[PDB]
Every structure is written in C-alpha cells, then in structure tokens.
Design a binder for this molecule. Sequence first.
Ligand SMILES: [Mn+2]
Length: 270
Amino acid sequence: KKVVLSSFSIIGDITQNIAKDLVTVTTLVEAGNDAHSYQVTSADAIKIQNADLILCNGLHLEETYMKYFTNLKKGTKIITVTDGINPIGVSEDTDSEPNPHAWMSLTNAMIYIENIRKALTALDPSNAKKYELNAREYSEKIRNSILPLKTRIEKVDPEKRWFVTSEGCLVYLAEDFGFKSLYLWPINSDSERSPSMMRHAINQMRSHKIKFIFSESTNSDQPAKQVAYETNASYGGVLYVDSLSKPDGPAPTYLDLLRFSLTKIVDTLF
Ligand SMILES: [Mn+2]
C-alpha cells in the first residue's frame, strides 16, 4: 500500500476524500500545529521517508521546512497542489512574495482536488477509475455545501463588499467572489506586524464605513478588537483558515472549514 504525505491538515483531508483508503494518507503539520512555522521532528522524518508522494501547498507555505524533504525514497515526487492558481502577492500594494492562502476559495478547492486526483492517479494508475469517481463526488459535495453561501454573499450591496481580517487569509476568497480585502498583516508567521499596516486598515475602514473585522483560530483577537474600537466597527469573531479544528470542534474537515468560515462571514454582512 502506498503512502501519501500531505504537508498540513487541509491537504491531508482533501486527499483522504479523494483516495478513501486506497493509499495511506499521512500529514506533516497536524491540525493545531502552525503550517507557517513548523519544526520537523524525528518522528516526522519517518513520515517523510515512508512517503511515496509528498503533497505541498506551495506558494511558499512550506518554505521554512522544505529543507526536510530531502534524502527521499527513490521515485518520490513533491507535488505542488496549487499549480494553475494565479498567485496573489503579499503586498497590499500591487510585485512580492506569494500569499499562500489559496485554499480559501470555491474555485480553488476544485483545483486542489484536481491536482491531487492527478497526482494520485500517476502514482497509482491501477485505481484511476476510483480516484476519478471519488474526485468528482467530493468536488460536488464541496459545491453543494459552499455554493449556497456564495449565492447569499453575492447579494451584498457593493459598498459593503469588503472582507476585513487580521491575517491576510481571505485574499483568494475576495478574488473568487468579487470582494475587496483589508487586513492587518499578510502572514501570521511574520514577527514584524506593522503599525503602518494597522494605521492603513483603520483609515480604510473609516473611509469605506466598513462594519466588521475578524480574527482567526490561530492568532490573537486583540489587534482586531482594537481596530474595531478605533473605527467604530464591530469585532466579527473567529474564522477558521490555517488549520482544521480538533475533531470535536467546528471545522474538523476542509469542507467544514470552508462552510464555517463562509457562514460566519455572510452572517456578518446581513
Ligand atoms: Mn495563515
């Protein structure tokens, strides 16, 4: 039985839905661990050795631990599951390093799925028909759950078309649905979170009468709450974007993560 190692929980879950136990699906950065800054352990290095295929996000998500994907099993490829996604830069001024959060998007969910289907099929061609069926079923499950939320979201008055968060985690969602983005820092890892970016967000929220700003499940709510105060806006609560929740939490699968976060967003806009 083949072993397919996913870099983090969101990719591992997508992969499990496509492979359904035809391969063993492992995960490097388990849920609750940070995919932006991770220390590969000795046990993790076993997972890396056992991998017949390695599935990474790319868009520099894994940049600080790519060095551990070395001394690999002969024939083991590293696949970038965001291939075909046009990158969005980390500069709020449009060039720069890529924003990695491409999975927060309905269109892109379909691309992650297709890339993973394609890679599994190249790895394990005797099961091509099963990966084919499974990928389509899962794509449809995603669409069936998430499309109605998009449909709701698209009714928003153009003046209110803003997703404002702490980390720049919704830039791909904004692009997918036709909203503008505002945030406090591009990526949670960066230890430099800047006064200028906070000042800018505050000024922009005032300018555009933006009513809500969120924080996320792996960062502090304190900046968002402060910005809310300074802008006469409201704190919108906690989104799930960077990791699956614990099994008994609200976002234990990728579909549940998208569904939770987009539900919470649309419940703010109306
Ligand atoms: Mn993040």
